[PDB]
Design a protein around this ligand. Structure first.
Ligand code: D3T
Ligand code: MG
Ligand code: NA
Ligand code: NA
Length: 332
DNA sequence: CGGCAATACTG
DNA sequence: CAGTAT
DNA sequence: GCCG
């Protein structure tokens, strides 16, 4: 009795197989660095299964029946169960390649491809990357420029303060608008790499053109250090940026502002609350098991044999016939 | 053996 | 398009 | 890497 999709089972903040799941997630990460999203995904699913188990895996046989556990995931677990360590995992963690790809990929703007190219070229440090400025995307120039701040875990108190500045901004334009903290904090975490906010208003349309003015406002306060505006397919609805959060005298924080109509707020909240892996299993389950496709705006039937609406996340869970799981249980 | 979540922007 | 972000 |  272990549902296959992570959106069918609870995934709490703290569980009973930390050592084991971290081992699998390291392989998932390593595969990622080797550009194998297939293997990364499979390891990630096994790790997710472990986070869900009601108690620690004492015997290698408690694995029997558990989905997503092939020969490879199985050998790794077994090895940690007897000797309390896995060689494949330790060699990965100690290897020069894994350690560098990790360091490079935590720089905002740097992904696996860029990281690999730089690695193959013999580059090994952030300072080596800074010496070649006329090569870096603006996203990366920013990541390197505020590297220290962006690496410092964000605290709930930083999230609070930002919510104060955002709500004040929104208040200068749209009275009665609501700003909701999403992302990991909504899931109960104490830290994050950034802060996510979802804005909306009860009256449809009363929120159009909101973001630009909110940004213009933050801009006048001279807090915007970087930004990128998005528009769903001025007049943009999403803002991915870095703000100078005063308190050093200030600290740079990544912030993502999302403006959504209240008709589709339940889908916006659902997508932006995560976890990341939770979204994937959710959307995958929507398709592979329900012929429908889910996104940040709504649920859709390729064939207009049915249309969808929702008032809360609970509604969206009904439409997919999934037992509800509050934010805190989506840490997949 | 094919699929693996679904979108938006920069360069 | 290639690559990175959520 | 695991699955249908
Ligand atoms: C990266 C990513 C994220 N999401 C959703 C689901 C989560 C929210 C917030 O993202 P974040 O990585 O900060 O996640 P968060 O959980 O807040 O992590 P931190 O605590 O900040 O590290 O966005 C997604 O659908 N697809 C993706 O590829
Ligand atoms: Mg976050
Ligand atoms: Na990065
Ligand atoms: Na984010």
């Amino acid at each position: 009795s272990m549902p296959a999709y992570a959106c069918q089972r609870p995934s709490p903040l703290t569980h009973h197989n930390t050592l084991l799941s971290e081992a699998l997630e390291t392989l998932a990460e390593a595969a990622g660095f080797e550009a194998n999203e297939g293997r990364l995904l499979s390891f990630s699913r096994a790790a997710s299964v472990l986070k869900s188990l009601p108690c620690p895996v004492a015997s290698l046989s408690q694995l029997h029946g558990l989905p997503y556990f092939g020969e490879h995931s199985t050998r790794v677990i077994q090895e940690l169960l007897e000797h309390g360590t896995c060689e494949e995992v330790k060699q990965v963690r100690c290897s020069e390649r894994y350690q560098t790809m990790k360091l490079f990929t935590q720089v905002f703007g740097v992904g696996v491809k860029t990281a690999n190219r730089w690695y193959q070229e013999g580059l090994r440090t952030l300072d080596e990357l800074r010496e070649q400025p006329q090569r870096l995307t603006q996203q990366q120039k920013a990541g390197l420029q505020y590297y220290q701040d962006l690496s410092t875990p964000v605290r709930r108190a930083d999230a609070e303060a930002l919510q104060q500045l955002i709500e004040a901004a929104v208040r200068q334009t749209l009275p009665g608008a609501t700003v909701t903290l999403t992302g990991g904090f909504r899931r109960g975490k104490l830290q994050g790499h950034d802060v996510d906010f979802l804005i909306t208003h009860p009256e449809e349309g009363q929120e159009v053109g909101l973001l630009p003015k909110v940004m213009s406002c933050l801009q006048s306060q001279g807090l915007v250090l970087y930004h990128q505006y998005h528009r769903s397919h001025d007049v943009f609805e999403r803002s991915f940026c870095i703000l100078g959060l005063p308190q050093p005298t200030w600290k740079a924080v990544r912030v993502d502002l999302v403006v959504t109509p209240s008709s589709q707020f339940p889908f916006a909240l659902l997508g932006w609350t995560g976890s990341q892996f939770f979204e994937r299993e959710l959307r995958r389950f929507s398709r592979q098991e329900k012929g429908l496709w889910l996104n940040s705006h709504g649920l859709f039937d390729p064939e207009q044999k049915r249309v969808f609406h929702a008032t809360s996340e609970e509604d969206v869970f009904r439409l997919l016939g999934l037992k509800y799981l509050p934010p805190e249980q989506r840490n997949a």
